[PDB]
Each structure stands twice: as C-alpha cells, then as structure tokens.
Write a protein that binds this ligand. Structure first.
Ligand SMILES: [Cl-]
Ligand code: NA
Length: 344
C-alpha cells in the first residue's frame, strides 16, 4: 500500500530518529515492505523444493525459508539501503555433496520462470570468513509482472552442502551464544576468526569445492589443532548445543513461568578438585537481566567455572527455528575437526 520512495523515506526517518505518530507510520511503511517479501519467499521455497525433488529423487535435500523479523530490520536501520536489500527473504537448500549442489544450481539456472537470477555468488572457494556455498540473488517477477504488487521483489537462495551448513551452524551458534560479533564486524576475536577461516578452507577442500595442496593442508591442520585447543571449540560446541537441547526439555519447560521471555545462564563446572563435573542452565526473568549479568561476571573469579555464557531465550528459539538440525550439524562439524586434528 506504499510507494518505494515512501519506504526509503521511512527507513531514513528511522535511521534519523523518530517518535510517536511519525514512528508508527514509519514502522507501518517498513513492515508493509517486509511482508511484501512473504509471498515471493513462500513461492521461491516451493520453486526450489520442486527443483530439489527433481535433482534428488529420494527427497532428502532440505529446503527452508526465513523472513527477516521487523525488529531485526529496525535495529539495522537504528544502528545498505532498505529497498536494495536481498536478504529480507531467504531460501536455503541443503544437499549431500558438491555434485548434487552443482546439479541443483544448474537446474535453477536452466529453469524458465518470471523470477530472474540477477547475480550468481560463487563461494566454492571460501570467503575471507571461511564460508563456502553458492548464492543466487533473485528478482522475483522481474520483467513479466502486469498489475503485480510483487514485481522486482528480491529473494536470496543459498545453496550449501551438509558439511558447509555444519560449518555455518557452528559459526552462528558461537557468534550468538558467545555474544561476540564475527558476522556483523570486521575486527576483534582473531583466534575465532582465523579458526573459522581455516576450518572453512578444510571443509571446502574435503567437500571438493576448493582442493588445496598437501603442504597447505598440513599447515592448515597444525594451525587448526593449535587454534582448537586454545579456544576449546569442540568442548564449547557440545556444551552450548547440549544447553540448548536442555532448554527444550519437558521437565524444564513445565518448571518455567508462563511465556518466559528471559535468559539462561549456561555454565560448565569442574568442581571435581573428589567432587562433580556438571553443565547447568539457570533461568532468569526479563526483569532480572542485570542480576543475570552480575552472576555471569562473578564467575570470572571462580576457577571451577570453565564455560559461562548468558543466552537470551529469544536468541535460543530463533536459532532452533533457523537451524532445526543444530544438534546433528554441530556434532558433524566437531567430528570433522577431530579427524583433521588427529592426522599428525
Ligand atoms: Cl538446520
Ligand atoms: Na532467579
């Protein structure tokens, strides 16, 4: 119900501060723009699913869709023009191998629909972050439209392999749970960033997306062994994903308050000196945020506390919704890490 100039003006008015009736109109303008991607998003999820079912007759390629939350869009404008964004709507196809990935990419390219691939982002050679896969940026209803309100809606399609998705899930889990910002920054955490780049490169080599020479492989595994022991990646992935699994537990869910929208203080304790070795989740209310931060910072003094992290229940639920197979993906990345670290 709004014009593209009205939507661009509303995004500007949110970046520039807004209040009251002016804000309600601006948030309605951007919310309208956001739910305009819902139809082409659900459409592209079915177009992609149809292609995946022709590529793998066994129906094992996993297809998913995700619409960026209104809250996430406003926070990006508060803290890349709105109408020029390709990530508002995104689809993801997870295939078993590089062969199956290239077949599905070609099936989508050769296909003839009103939905055009504007750019093909080939990341079979890992990005500086370590990420590998292929992204197809679509302009749905690009030329053939008519009285179509969804003319030129941008939807991104990410094609990735089971191991490339295992790498991406583990990155998202460490990034979100450790509260560090690898994805939304170009600085800090050198050991985490370098660990993800090298492991990403090893994923691309193993998958056959970017084969590296024997010497580089050897050097990359020594670097990886060193980075993994320094950061304790395997131990953290197991603890964080088990703690997330524990939040979805029936006994825990019955003990929690109604529509709990708070925090979970995840810990790993070595009180074995003989004592006990445990992993605990402690829930907090939304009002008890500071009390929760005070308990988290108090554990730095405790030598028994090996892992201590504060998780918002909204971050937990969205990670489980965006990565339904996070338990398995994480374990498959740790097994991958283990087989490269035990080489020499
Ligand atoms: Cl998943
Ligand atoms: Na409490």
């Amino acid at each position: 119900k709004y014009s593209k100039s009205q939507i661009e003006k509303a995004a500007r008015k949110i970046r520039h501060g807004c209040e009251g009736a002016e804000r309600e109109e601006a948030i309605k303008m951007i919310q309208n723009f956001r739910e305009l991607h819902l139809y082409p998003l659900m459409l592209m999820k079915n177009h992609l699913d149809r292609a995946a079912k022709k590529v793998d007759k066994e129906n094992k390629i996993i297809v998913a869709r995700r619409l960026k939350r209104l809250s996430t869009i406003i926070d990006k404008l508060e803290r890349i023009a709105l109408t020029r964004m390709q990530d508002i709507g995104g689809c993801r196809a997870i295939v078993r191998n590089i062969e199956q990935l290239k077949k599905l990419k070609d099936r989508l390219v050769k296909s003839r629909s009103k939905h055009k691939i504007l750019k093909e982002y080939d990341y079979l050679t890992p990005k500086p972050s370590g990420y590998s896969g292929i992204h197809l940026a679509y302009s749905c209803f690009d030329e053939e439209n008519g009285n179509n309100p969804w003319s030129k809606t941008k939807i991104e399609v990410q094609l990735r392999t089971e191991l490339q998705h295992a790498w991406a899930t583990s990155l998202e889990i460490i990034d979100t749970l450790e509260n560090i910002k690898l994805k939304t920054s170009n600085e800090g955490h050198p050991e985490w960033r370098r660990f993800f780049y090298l492991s990403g490169c090893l994923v691309a080599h193993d998958e056959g997306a970017c084969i590296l020479d024997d010497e580089t492989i050897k050097n990359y595994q020594t670097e990886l062994k060193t980075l993994e022991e320094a950061l304790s990646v395997r131990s953290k992935l197991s603890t964080y994903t088990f703690a997330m699994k524990l939040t979805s537990d029936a006994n825990l869910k019955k003990s929690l308050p109604k529509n709990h929208n708070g925090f979970f203080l995840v810990r790993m304790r070595n009180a074995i000196t003989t004592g006990k070795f445990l992993v605990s989740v402690k829930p907090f209310r939304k009002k008890e945020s500071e009390q929760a931060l005070q308990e988290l910072n108090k554990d730095d003094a405790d030598p028994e506390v090996l892992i201590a992290v504060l998780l918002a229940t909204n971050n937990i639920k969205s990670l489980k919704k965006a990565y339904p197979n996070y338990f398995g993906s994480t374990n498959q990345f740790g097994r991958f890490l283990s087989r490269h670290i035990d080489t020499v």
